[PDB]
Design a binder for this molecule. Sequence first.
Ligand SMILES: Nc1ncnc2c1ncn2[C@@H]1O[C@H](COP(=O)(O)OP(=O)(O)OP(=O)(O)O)[C@@H](O)[C@H]1O
Ligand SMILES: Nc1ncnc2c1ncn2[C@@H]1O[C@H](COP(=O)(O)OP(=O)(O)OP(=O)(O)O)[C@@H](O)[C@H]1O
Ligand SMILES: [Mg+2]
Ligand SMILES: [Mg+2]
Lengths: 149, 149, 149
Amino acid sequence: HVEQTYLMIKPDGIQRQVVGEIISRFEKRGYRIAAMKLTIATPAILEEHYAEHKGKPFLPGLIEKMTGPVLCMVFEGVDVIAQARKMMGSTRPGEAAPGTIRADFCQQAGRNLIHGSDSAESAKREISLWFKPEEIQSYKLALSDYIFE
Amino acid sequence: HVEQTYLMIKPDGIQRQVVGEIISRFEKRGYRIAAMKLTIATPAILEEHYAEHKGKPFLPGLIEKMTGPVLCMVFEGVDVIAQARKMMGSTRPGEAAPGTIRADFCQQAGRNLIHGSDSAESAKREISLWFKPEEIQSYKLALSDYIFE
Amino acid sequence: HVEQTYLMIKPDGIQRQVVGEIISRFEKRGYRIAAMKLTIATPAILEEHYAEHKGKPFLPGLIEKMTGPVLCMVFEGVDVIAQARKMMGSTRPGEAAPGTIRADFCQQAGRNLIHGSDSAESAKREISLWFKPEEIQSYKLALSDYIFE
Ligand SMILES: Nc1ncnc2c1ncn2[C@@H]1O[C@H](COP(=O)(O)OP(=O)(O)OP(=O)(O)O)[C@@H](O)[C@H]1O
Ligand SMILES: Nc1ncnc2c1ncn2[C@@H]1O[C@H](COP(=O)(O)OP(=O)(O)OP(=O)(O)O)[C@@H](O)[C@H]1O
Ligand SMILES: [Mg+2]
Ligand SMILES: [Mg+2]
């Protein structure tokens, strides 16, 4: 039983040129790349992505920080929504555990390199927001017998 | 005072071709390779290895997963039995801490890449099962003065 | 606001030839190298460095272990004093969290690879002990807009 999560490399991940390192951390667990697209995020899509923060005082600055190149991604694996959140670490890098992306790469929450869906409902919504169904690619990893019990 | 632990790369570690990465994690701490051998695990040896689980419903499938190439290893260091367990992380990769082998490489307990002895008694038993005493090598690490206090 | 911490690679870090790896861990978070100097630590300077341990029974052996080549460093970043301590891990490598320097490289407290200031007051004192003000270099990281919120 696998699931799919939406992971997005933020403009800081692009500009610091750590895209490959980020992808490698998820590939290392045998997570499958189901979708991937470079785009430039717009305020319109970011308002919907961050709909849960509508009307809040930090939202305008958050949208500004995120208006730039982003790598949209879908990864598949067992419990991958919760596991990817664990791998990213706490929102504030200073509170994130050693060995997580945010602790290993970042200093402040406003430049914390990566987004990941936080629940099954948010993963389904975010994947549908950033990807059309034809962009989601179905294939089986050749090492599946050695990844899944 | 140093001790020795039995560590075994399971068929998934061989087939995913991460043997060198695993070894490097233990070398990085100045643990000494006291024994190393590639073999193919068979049911009769695995039944001894997993003797405590004789008769449990999960055992036949466990033996099937483990019937394959394995890298038998003995590493030596301070508190190495407990430390190697900590480095591997929880049996269930989803519960394992970031930075541990199972958290960094794996998804499920049935394919969790590596075995390590859980106690002094188990290390003696497992080293005797998988190695002949001839295969344990005695030598001193040249960097000892900078590894040990 | 950013702050500055004193970090020192101990003789074991020099002799095990892991200097670059240590530096890379701090650079990876966008911490800025403000000062760096290779020297050979001597008892007189180490007595001042370890002044808080004056008169204690273990101090003589600590000074002996530390008499050797060291890399003096100053790193700058948000909350860098506390964060560098978190990255180093517990004094005892066996208690340190996976993903920390001491857990990843070391076995025992007496050979734990690296020193870092434990407080704002000790950072100011240690930077002044090991560096003259003219050795502290001020420049801005080109990726600042993507590191700091
Ligand atoms: N009170 C606040 N003041 C300023 N910025 C905030 C505040 N709360 C949240 N943010 C910003 O909102 C961003 C997203 O916040 P959220 O609570 O969704 O965290 P997250 O789930 O870790 O992030 P993401 O969805 O990007 O993975 C954080 O990176 C932070 O920059
Ligand atoms: N009981 C001990 N056995 C061995 N070494 C010790 C012991 N106590 C202290 N040391 C050594 O003394 C150094 C200074 O001790 P302290 O309590 O200041 O730890 P620390 O703050 O982690 O170390 P450092 O200042 O080197 O970063 C320790 O890093 C360790 O190298
Ligand atoms: Mg969020
Ligand atoms: Mg100290």
